[PDB]
Amino acid sequence: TGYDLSNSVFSPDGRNFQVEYAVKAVENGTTSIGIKCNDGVVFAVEKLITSKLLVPQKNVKIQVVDRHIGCVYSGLIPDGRHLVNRGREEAASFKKLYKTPIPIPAFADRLGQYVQAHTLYNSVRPFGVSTIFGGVDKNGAHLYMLEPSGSYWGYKGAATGKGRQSAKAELEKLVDHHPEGLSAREAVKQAAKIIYLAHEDNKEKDFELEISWCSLSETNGLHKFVKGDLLQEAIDFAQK
Amino acid sequence: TQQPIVTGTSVISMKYDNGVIIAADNLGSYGSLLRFNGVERLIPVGDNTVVGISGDISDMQHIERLLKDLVTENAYDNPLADAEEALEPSYIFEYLATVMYQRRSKMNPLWNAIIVAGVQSNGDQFLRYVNLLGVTYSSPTLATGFGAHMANPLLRKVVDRESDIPKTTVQVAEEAIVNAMRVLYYRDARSSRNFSLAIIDKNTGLTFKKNLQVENMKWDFAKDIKGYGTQK
């Protein structure tokens, strides 16, 4: 009843309703997906073309942290940009202190602490974004998803946004059918296919597909967008 | 920095018709002790810029960290980072000069002298100098410290005016640079026989040569020198 009007107020059942409302805000965004392959990660996202006056291939959504971390988010885009700026500051501080690129689990913990710190007071608002991020470090490839409550986990495949249910079903089938794993290019094709399938929930507007990847054998452990013939091949595979 | 401890020697550079050439030795000296061998003092920032640093080695490493941070920050939210939005030698020099002058104004200088060399996007050569006081200047040939007394007179023989730049080929410029390095090894007591060189050309790419050694020297006539004055 009255327990939903302020952040960091426990309900009688032990709930924080402002965080749940932030999750509701997240559920109204576009679909973002991440796939973990044998030696890297692939991030894919759908961008709605509200008007034909939007310049194609501009308005980039996927963002980069340091030179090896990829991040995408669903929800209120400015909140995601705020979180990415904070993550860039954290990575810079870690690199300055310890002369090594920040490991992915450490970056995930720093982001989680920052998100969680916004559920502790009623003078601030929880972040309205769910973030799928990851990359490659000395231990290998890592993929994580972070929720508005500050909780995060590592995933074999993650999906968020309005079309999250169908994307999760497709990811589960993909994981079940490939116990050994997937290559980076095959992961790019599958991400294109899954984004196209998940868009079928929202047929009212056209969409553009954006894909990025970070792999040891394809980008030498750096994060790079997919823009050339590979992007067209993935689009053709998805539309097939 | 109030007093340098580990220091590198001069860096020399010149412009030719198509690009720029820069060079520096690989020695870090510790108060008349030739302590560290294998110190790279030329830092390539991208594909169109090389920064050559002389003076305190710790401040040089700090500057290298700053340059890497600048590249990383430029790459953020910039799909044209490998395109018309890439960093340029002018940007890098302006940033470095701002840092040097601000730190001088706080009585906490970076005890260094820096030459930035490269090629702009339009193809024009870039070569400029800034020191620990923030003093900046440009010339067809540049050198700091000891080289400024011995390398500049030789290099100005090849390129004496701005009009001589189009006449100077890369081969002549590189030969002049190598000869200047040999002269410095002859007469500079804080110098090393091993050095590195970098060529930035508008048509071809950046060429970074390491492990270059001063070649055949003239020492035979020393056998003719007897004792001072009247001996023998």
Swiss-Prot record, chain A:
Major subcellular site: cytoplasm
Gene Ontology BP annotations: proteasomal ubiquitin-independent protein catabolic process; proteasome-mediated ubiquitin-dependent protein catabolic process
Misc: Present with 12000 molecules/cell in log phase SD medium.
Swiss-Prot/TrEMBL keywords: Acetylation, Cytoplasm, Nucleus, Proteasome
Complexes and interactors: The 26S proteasome consists of a 20S proteasome core and two 19S regulatory subunits. The 20S proteasome core is composed of 28 subunits that are arranged in four stacked rings, resulting in a barrel-shaped structure. The two end rings are each formed by seven alpha subunits, and the two central rings are each formed by seven beta subunits. The catalytic chamber with the active sites is on the inside of the barrel.
Protein name: Probable proteasome subunit alpha type-7
Subcellular compartments: Cytoplasm; Nucleus
GO molecular function: mRNA binding
Whole-protein coverage range: 6 to 245 of 288
GO cellular component: nucleus; proteasome complex; proteasome core complex, alpha-subunit complex; proteasome storage granule
Family, per entry: Belongs to the peptidase T1A family.
Post-translational modification as stated in the protein's UniProt record: The alpha and beta forms are probably products of the same gene with different post-translational modifications.
Source domain of life: Eukaryota
Function: The proteasome degrades poly-ubiquitinated proteins in the cytoplasm and in the nucleus. It is essential for the regulated turnover of proteins and for the removal of misfolded proteins. The proteasome is a multicatalytic proteinase complex that is characterized by its ability to cleave peptides with Arg, Phe, Tyr, Leu, and Glu adjacent to the leaving group at neutral or slightly basic pH. It has an ATP-dependent proteolytic activity.
Curated annotation (Swiss-Prot), chain B:
Keyword Cytoplasm among record annotations: yes
GO annotations of cellular component type: cytosol; nucleus; proteasome complex; proteasome core complex, beta-subunit complex; proteasome storage granule
GO biological process, one term: proteasomal ubiquitin-independent protein catabolic process
KW Cytoplasm (keyword) present: yes
InterPro entries: Ntn_hydrolases_N, Proteasome_beta4, Proteasome_bsu_CS, Proteasome_sua/b, Proteasome_suB-type
Keyword terms: Cytoplasm, Nucleus, Proteasome
Subunit structure: The 26S proteasome consists of a 20S proteasome core and two 19S regulatory subunits. The 20S proteasome core is composed of 28 subunits that are arranged in four stacked rings, resulting in a barrel-shaped structure. The two end rings are each formed by seven alpha subunits, and the two central rings are each formed by seven beta subunits. The catalytic chamber with the active sites is on the inside of the barrel. Interacts with CIC1.
Note: Present with 16900 molecules/cell in log phase SD medium.
Family: Belongs to the peptidase T1B family.
Function summary: Non-catalytic component of the proteasome which degrades poly-ubiquitinated proteins in the cytoplasm and in the nucleus. It is essential for the regulated turnover of proteins and for the removal of misfolded proteins. The proteasome is a multicatalytic proteinase complex that is characterized by its ability to cleave peptides with Arg, Phe, Tyr, Leu, and Glu adjacent to the leaving group at neutral or slightly basic pH. It has an ATP-dependent proteolytic activity. PRE3 and PRE4 are necessary for the peptidyl-glutamyl-peptide-hydrolyzing activity.
Name of this chain's protein: Proteasome subunit beta type-7
Species: Saccharomyces cerevisiae (strain ATCC 204508 / S288c) (Baker's yeast)
